[PDB]
Amino acid sequence: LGALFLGFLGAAGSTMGAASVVLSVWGIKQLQARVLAVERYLRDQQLLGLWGCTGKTICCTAVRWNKTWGNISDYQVIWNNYTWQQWDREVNNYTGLIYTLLEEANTQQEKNEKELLELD
Amino acid sequence: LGALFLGFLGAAGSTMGAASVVLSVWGIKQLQARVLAVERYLRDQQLLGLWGCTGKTICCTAVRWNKTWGNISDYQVIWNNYTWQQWDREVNNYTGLIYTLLEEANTQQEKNEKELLELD
Amino acid sequence: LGALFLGFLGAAGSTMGAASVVLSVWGIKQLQARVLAVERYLRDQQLLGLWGCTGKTICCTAVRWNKTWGNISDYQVIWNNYTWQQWDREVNNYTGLIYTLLEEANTQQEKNEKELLELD
Amino acid sequence: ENWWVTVYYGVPVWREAKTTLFCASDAKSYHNIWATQACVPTDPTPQEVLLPNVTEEFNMWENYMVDQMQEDIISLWEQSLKPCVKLTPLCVTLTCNNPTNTDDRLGDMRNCSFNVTTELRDKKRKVYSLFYVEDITAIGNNSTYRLINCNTTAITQACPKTSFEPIPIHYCAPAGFALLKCNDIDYKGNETCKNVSTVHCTHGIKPVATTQLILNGSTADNQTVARIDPSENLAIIQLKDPVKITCRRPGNNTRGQIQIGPAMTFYNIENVVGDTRKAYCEINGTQWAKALNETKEVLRNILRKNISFMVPSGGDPEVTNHHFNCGGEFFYCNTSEIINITKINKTENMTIIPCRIRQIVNSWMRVGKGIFAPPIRGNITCTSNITGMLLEIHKNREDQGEDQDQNNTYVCLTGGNMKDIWRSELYKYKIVEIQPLGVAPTKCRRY
Amino acid sequence: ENWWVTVYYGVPVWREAKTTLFCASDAKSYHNIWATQACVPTDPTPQEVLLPNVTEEFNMWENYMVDQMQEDIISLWEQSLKPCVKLTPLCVTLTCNNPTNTDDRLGDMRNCSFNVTTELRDKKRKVYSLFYVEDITAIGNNSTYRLINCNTTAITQACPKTSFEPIPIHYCAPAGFALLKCNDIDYKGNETCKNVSTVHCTHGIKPVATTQLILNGSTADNQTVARIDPSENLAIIQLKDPVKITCRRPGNNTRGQIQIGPAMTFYNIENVVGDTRKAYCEINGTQWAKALNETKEVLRNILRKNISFMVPSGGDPEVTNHHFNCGGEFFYCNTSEIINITKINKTENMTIIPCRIRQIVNSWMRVGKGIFAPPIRGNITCTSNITGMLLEIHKNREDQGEDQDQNNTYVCLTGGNMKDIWRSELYKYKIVEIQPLGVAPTKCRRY
Amino acid sequence: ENWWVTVYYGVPVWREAKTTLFCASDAKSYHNIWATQACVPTDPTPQEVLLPNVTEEFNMWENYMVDQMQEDIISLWEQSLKPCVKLTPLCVTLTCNNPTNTDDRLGDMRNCSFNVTTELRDKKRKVYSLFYVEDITAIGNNSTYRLINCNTTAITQACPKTSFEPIPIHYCAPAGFALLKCNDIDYKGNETCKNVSTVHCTHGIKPVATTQLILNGSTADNQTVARIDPSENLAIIQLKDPVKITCRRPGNNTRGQIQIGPAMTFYNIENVVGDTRKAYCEINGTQWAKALNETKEVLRNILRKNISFMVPSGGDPEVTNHHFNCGGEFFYCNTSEIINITKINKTENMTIIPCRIRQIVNSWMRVGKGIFAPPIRGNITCTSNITGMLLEIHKNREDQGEDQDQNNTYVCLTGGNMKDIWRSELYKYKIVEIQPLGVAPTKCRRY
Ligand SMILES: *[C@@H]1O[C@H](CO)[C@@H](O[C@@H]2O[C@H](CO)[C@@H](O[C@@H]3O[C@H](CO[C@H]4O[C@H](CO)[C@@H](O)[C@H](O)[C@@H]4O)[C@@H](O)[C@H](O[C@H]4O[C@H](CO[C@H]5O[C@H](CO)[C@@H](O)[C@H](O)[C@@H]5O)[C@@H](O)[C@H](O[C@H]5O[C@H](CO)[C@@H](O)[C@H](O)[C@@H]5O)[C@@H]4O)[C@@H]3O)[C@H](O)[C@H]2NC(C)=O)[C@H](O)[C@H]1NC(C)=O
Ligand SMILES: *[C@@H]1O[C@H](CO)[C@@H](O[C@@H]2O[C@H](CO)[C@@H](O[C@@H]3O[C@H](CO[C@H]4O[C@H](CO)[C@@H](O)[C@H](O)[C@@H]4O)[C@@H](O)[C@H](O[C@H]4O[C@H](CO[C@H]5O[C@H](CO)[C@@H](O)[C@H](O)[C@@H]5O)[C@@H](O)[C@H](O[C@H]5O[C@H](CO)[C@@H](O)[C@H](O)[C@@H]5O)[C@@H]4O)[C@@H]3O)[C@H](O)[C@H]2NC(C)=O)[C@H](O)[C@H]1NC(C)=O
Ligand SMILES: *[C@@H]1O[C@H](CO)[C@@H](O[C@@H]2O[C@H](CO)[C@@H](O[C@@H]3O[C@H](CO[C@H]4O[C@H](CO)[C@@H](O)[C@H](O)[C@@H]4O)[C@@H](O)[C@H](O[C@H]4O[C@H](CO[C@H]5O[C@H](CO)[C@@H](O)[C@H](O)[C@@H]5O)[C@@H](O)[C@H](O[C@H]5O[C@H](CO)[C@@H](O)[C@H](O)[C@@H]5O)[C@@H]4O)[C@@H]3O)[C@H](O)[C@H]2NC(C)=O)[C@H](O)[C@H]1NC(C)=O
Ligand SMILES: *[C@@H]1O[C@H](CO)[C@@H](O)[C@H](O)[C@H]1NC(C)=O
Ligand SMILES: *[C@@H]1O[C@H](CO)[C@@H](O)[C@H](O)[C@H]1NC(C)=O
Ligand SMILES: *[C@@H]1O[C@H](CO)[C@@H](O)[C@H](O)[C@H]1NC(C)=O
Ligand SMILES: *[C@@H]1O[C@H](CO)[C@@H](O)[C@H](O)[C@H]1NC(C)=O
Ligand SMILES: *[C@@H]1O[C@H](CO)[C@@H](O)[C@H](O)[C@H]1NC(C)=O
Ligand SMILES: *[C@@H]1O[C@H](CO)[C@@H](O)[C@H](O)[C@H]1NC(C)=O
Ligand SMILES: *[C@@H]1O[C@H](CO)[C@@H](O)[C@H](O)[C@H]1NC(C)=O
């Protein structure tokens, strides 16, 4: 029992562009697994929190996509001919770079221009 | 010690329309009860998260109220003559239906019209 | 392993105005410390939640700053000549007062004027 | 229009549920078996909130908190006897006699010499001891005595530094649960209360393990009340007037040491020094007369029949006797005389209940974990209050032959359960779970 | 333009990982060692979701769930023997003989009298017992017998109220992990499945500890299959046709009691009453003929060589015998006759496997925690299904001298590991971890 | 205007607090009592951050990490001796003599024969053993010897596969706490540091249990320092120059086995084979001369008085002797000669400290859990560094009669606490709690 998770992964075999969103012994096992699941969920909420996206499922941002970030071709082919398992191989080697650029470009680039350019 | 909960239930006996918002052995007991309270809170945050209401206390939505959803009369009588314990009896049998309709009408009906009708 | 925390406190010795944001035995130790860290984080999310600031790092509000709240002089001196350790001494004695005034001035003063002054 | 859906979050909705409670102790920690240790310190502010216009039903006879606290006391009692020494090698043939020579403790004690294995595992030596007669049974046609409970269960003595003193313990609910408390001046047991208030923590409960009489308990505030099971077996009487009771064991006890094994240090009642008078308890007869004469009418108005009492039958000191815990001793007291107050209230001086000392207790008749009492050196008294009794319902007009109208034959006055005391302190509290979600129709509509 | 970064959250991305699973039991709780207790009740809806266009590889011979469930069964078996009594003081010189006087249980039993210490720790008395001959070895030139395993390991008897009955246990993944299940009609062991579906919980597994033969197991659905290790030692055969097997021990057993110590109550086989016939098992020979003749071809097509069988060599009843667990008994059955079905299928009546009873078991040849079987009073039978076997790969054309083309010399048919049975039920399931973060390029740009 | 309230969240605010730390071990796992097991593997990057303009005070003599790590070592030592066998039935009358016949180990060993119970619980047999004389006391007027600590505490031998080798252990704070580290070249003990940096993990600490001398420790980097308690009892000296020390026990030891009970396998020192020379330690005298002559001035400048030394008084080998742990042995070394370096530095060859072997240790004089050392077969040496000492403050000019100006009478040089070593490695680290909330006035105002 977690009763909290989303994404029951059913349409994973379909095309990525058209999925578009889904929707004692065992006592010690429970008291370990609940804490593991709770902390693993809160880590996702922390990566989602620093991007200005707490509560959303789909976000945009201001960060441009580099053409070195993965093997880059026509992006419409990437939507039409891949799945998440195929694209996730090309996601790697670019994890920490993008995950630092988003935290720089949201909490610093937007908030400073909100507080300093607009005086109030 | 949870130090996190809201709603200390004091004005529950008053009318629902005018409440309007409030504001070893024991070591194993602690290590069980803290995890239980944390997971029970995160489940409420998950039901609140998929409705586009993370951080709010009062929300509106676009979902119409069916006149079969509970015993329906003049709704001003429902605000003026009930409490939460009285209304919660009529809430049941309609839990999962509304809790699926909200998740459909927020994360799919608004986000698709945000991303596709508005190109940017 | 928490993998969730922010604020690795590096620029703490610098001026407060220019920091501007950062970015078995041991099994029982893990199963205690993880739960402690998770609950301590969720308490911060509860104090941040009732202020209308879930997901933000920097907020404004409508609450005026009393000139009895700490030893009050030119506030530009407070930004230019203090650090957080110096200002936190003057923060105390005013904890619960401000932490109740914010929860009153957000969830009650804004939400009532949102729902009643604007009919929809 | 269809008034669209709103979702609140500060929503006071109750559901009855079962969960785990936890400690709140006063800051008196200085091992006193309940230990005041790994136990949450209390909050200095007793936080409660009244709840007007609330009609709530809660059942005393199905209260989960009682079984929770019984399991807590049993597990705590088991943990507290773990690091102490076992008393296994003491089971041996005992050569006993009278020690040496009305109201003489030495007449109820035997002098027993026996062979014990020393620390060398070969050289047994002859030591001697004193024991009370109700912990020794016979084998043969001369001395040849058995220490009791060598065929039933294992016996471990208690560590002498511990104390059996009942500390107060508050119970509190974890965050996410609430404790409903009734505040009516009387409560029948199973109906709807009116003046209901929530509270974060219960009042202090002293786990006073006893029978025939409830000690250091909570008193009713208008009249003595009779909380009755559905004619099942028993009924709890809660008095208004606390009745003072004193109990005494005079004199010292010279204590020795015997090395059974490596750090297996048996403590021996070596000699009785000061006074030979038996252990006895003493109550004021007029207060007890008023209490019984009140209890008869409180039972009489409800059961519609005139009240009698009967001396308990022969058998177990679970039910025949009273069972204190005064200091580090266990008193078995003969209360078959005290329920006769028409004769008793003539003597304006005071009345005396005789009591006997027991060293070996199969614990509390429900735990049964055989504890050997350590000898308490010293002149010892203890006083306490009488607040409640555990009466057993009379047998009907089918078992006694004679009329049972006007002849309510209370053949016993007992409850062997330690649980039933704990029902007499948690008749007020209910555990509820908050459902803070809420769904309502309203005027607005989100854009 | 550079299509800007989007971050989804409902993202189905797999990573292979290792984690802790948990229980799902059917609601049949009424202590039956696996206890149906502190074990999660099942969900009434078996929730699975199909996954088309999924090509997933998963390895049977590296499955973490097997070692997980072996450690679960070992820790459960250790916990279940904790509160029962030790059997340490029974190790003593035994004066034995024949009790009194083909297919006679009394010929395989000995009458042994011995001195045991009573509850008095001094007065030893002479009691007597019956024991099976395979739990007793010799000392001297006359009677002078030793109870076995007094030099190897400690022996604790089981509590008689427990049952060794294998309950079904489902395994489920915690929230945040998924269980991939193949659905192909055959599976070679280590390749890519096609019809893959996720499921929250596995099907029911009965932990039936045995060897030479897999009992109450899952059957294949098209043909008998041969899951082979990489020519390492063994290969698991899974039949299609379940083969019925019955096993019998006739007659009653009069049972006595002997007080070893305080609440140390040994149970004694006092007398054999009803019938003297040995314990035996019985199978249909034609079904077994079909099963072996199928298994020969299933191994023959894969290993390209014509199949032989060989009787196991002399040694351990781990490998020489069958090992049931019928009721509260342990059968060691002699299966060296049953692998000869050309002679056996002539008798159209039925065939008989003789079996012997064992009271003392060093548990399961991998745990080794010495359990003394409690005596089962009663006429006892049990029937079950034969679904699988644990054959050992033949020795190559380097060890046997003669040709090993056309002569696949299965010198044994065993697996001593209880783990290898549990590999024959978890060849379908893989634990994966969901990575719900996701990073993509897209048309939008946040203002 | 009143500059309205802002709430930041990346807020570096400190509060001093107490919490639970955890492991970080190097990846060297191949049971070596500290076990490198259930212990977090280290991070390959030592992550620290400097903190300029930080003036922080932290007290060495109130550091919670020291008591934390003492409780960790005691609980680990208790867990590691749990599965090993007890040595209870070895307590028996011992018939001893000289084995057979300057610097002879056999003169300090006794040959002891005794009756032990076999696996049959009736047939006791006569076995024999060798023991060191400091583990045996007397009973009668001839041989009649007692194995020591049969009246004080229970003795369990160690499992022989374990090793007493001190592995390095890093301590790290959980997420939500930080570890402040000073970086000054000297630290008086209780003042304000200047060059302060935070770090996620401490450096490696080897739990080397010893006394009179700190082994394999951290050295100071400018001069030898004297961290003093507030004239309470003692003072920790930390040298700059590591002084090499070698210790030797030559020859083999033939080892036998004796079955006490079921899997109760006592290991016996059967015979001494190779060389008869006593166990001895060896240091360079010039380095020790420089170290003492430095330590005298470091204490002299602070306590303003000229420094003396005194040989320790008669009593406990807790304080009279050195206490190594070389291999699976326990050395008690006589250091009353080595503090006289004016005579000692004349011999340019080397100097020799004699040492004695002990098999029975009441562990570490604070745990006291009686461990029987297993016999180590083999020629054995071990070398190490001398980095620190635990000197005791001299007695004042009120107890010694003669002048205590210029006569600082160090009557002992000891610390019996294992805690005081652990104060000599955690003088740098403070646990702080981050308060990330923050409240400030600012120019903005939310609409
Ligand atoms: C219903 O409620 C009433 C009201 O509370 C209960 O009556 C109480 O019963 C207690 C016994 O269970 C009584 O406690 C004993 O009191 C003795 C006299 O205390 C005097 O002095 C204190 C000030 O210290 C004062 O407040 C009091 O009014 C009296 O004037 C004490 O002597 C006795 O000491 C016992 O404990 C020591 C060691 O225990 C110490 O440490 C414990 C923590 O480990 C701590 O919990 C204890 O409180 C205590 O500080 C023990 O060594 C003693 O035994 C021998 O000690 C030396 C040799 O070592 C020897 O010289 C000496 O003579 C003893 O032979 C001793 O057992 C207790 O503290 C309490 O006073 C009663 N209250 C009243 C108002 O009378 C009643 O029991 C309840 N009903 C039921 C059924 O339980
Ligand atoms: C492969 O799968 C098959 C199919 O399941 C397995 O066969 C089963 O094997 C079981 C034994 O391991 C069998 O259970 C025994 O069944 C006996 C006969 O049951 C009849 O009545 C029941 C209705 O109750 C009916 O369903 C059934 O069909 C039969 O007609 C029972 O007598 C026997 O009772 C045993 O247990 C009692 C106490 O245990 C009770 O409480 C337990 C909880 O603590 C609970 O789990 C138990 O189920 C039970 O309710 C025990 O006291 C008995 O011992 C003596 O009892 C009194 C004295 O106290 C004495 O008078 C009596 O004669 C006994 O001497 C007794 O040991 C079991 O329930 C099961 O029936 C078999 N199933 C089939 C279809 O035949 C097979 O074992 C599997 N293969 C392998 C290798 O394991
Ligand atoms: C201060 O720091 C110094 C520096 O570390 C400490 O000195 C060390 O002290 C250790 C002892 O506590 C020494 O370890 C022993 O080293 C012996 C010689 O090792 C040689 O070979 C190794 C390569 O393997 C090489 O690196 C080294 O330099 C030497 O050339 C070893 O023989 C001895 O083995 C011991 O352990 C085995 C089994 O233990 C194995 O498994 C353990 C896991 O369970 C694992 O932790 C161990 O490392 C080891 O791999 C044990 O069976 C041995 O006992 C007998 O074994 C057989 C019979 O079974 C028999 O034939 C043999 O002769 C033995 O009688 C044996 O006890 C240790 O590994 C270490 O070398 C020292 N370091 C230096 C640089 O000298 C010093 O102790 C510290 N100060 C204090 C006060 O502690
Ligand atoms: C009992 O002993 C105490 C001290 O142990 C002493 O003060 C007291 O007088 C003794 N009482 C009698 C009656 O001997
Ligand atoms: C007791 O009450 C009954 C009425 O239920 C009455 O008949 C009877 O006479 C009464 N007896 C006495 C002694 O008052
Ligand atoms: C075995 O005992 C049972 C009852 O204990 C009885 O019904 C049955 O007839 C007995 N069987 C034989 C063969 O004696
Ligand atoms: C078994 O198969 C081999 C081919 O691998 C063949 O040479 C041999 O003759 C066969 N033997 C029998 C008995 O069929
Ligand atoms: C000690 O024993 C080892 C092997 O056990 C051997 O190599 C060595 O020479 C022996 N030493 C002496 C001094 O006998
Ligand atoms: C030691 O120092 C004191 C000064 O505190 C001095 O009076 C004394 O003479 C000195 N003694 C020696 C031997 O240097
Ligand atoms: C063996 O002993 C000799 C002298 O007895 C010594 O030189 C050598 O270092 C020792 N070797 C070991 C491995 O202990």
Author numbering:
A (entry chain F), B (entry chain B), C (entry chain E): 515 to 537, 569 to 618, 618A, 619 to 664
D (entry chain A), E (entry chain D), F (entry chain C): 32 to 61, 66 to 136, 143 to 148, 153 to 185, 187 to 278, 282 to 305, 308 to 321, 321A, ...
Please quote the authors directly.
We solved the structure of the MT145K trimer by cryo-EM to a global resolution of ∼4.1 Å. To date, our structure represents the only atomic-level structure of an SIV Env trimer. Overall, the MT145K trimer configuration closely resembles that of the trimeric HIV Env spike, with an overall Cα root-mean-square deviation (RMSD) of 1.9 Å (Kwon et al., 2015). Notably, the V1 and V2 loops are largely solvent exposed and occlude access to the underlying V3 loop. Inaccessibility of the V3 loop is mediated by intra-protomer interactions of V1V2 to V3 and by extensive inter-protomer V1V2 trimer interactions at the apex of the spike. Intriguingly, the FP region, which has been observed to be solvent exposed on the outside of the HIV Env, is positioned in a pocket inside the MT145K trimer and remains sequestered in all three protomers. Therefore, to gain or improve binding of the V2-apex bnAb inferred precursor Abs to the MT145 Env trimer, we substituted a glutamine (Q) with a lysine (K) residue (HXB2 position 171) in strand C of the V2-apex bnAb core epitope. In fact, the MT145K N334 glycan is positioned in a direction away from the V3-N332 epitope site, making it impossible to facilitate bnAb binding to this epitope. MT145K lacks the N276 glycan and the proximal N234 glycan, present in most HIV Envs, but instead has a glycan at position 236.
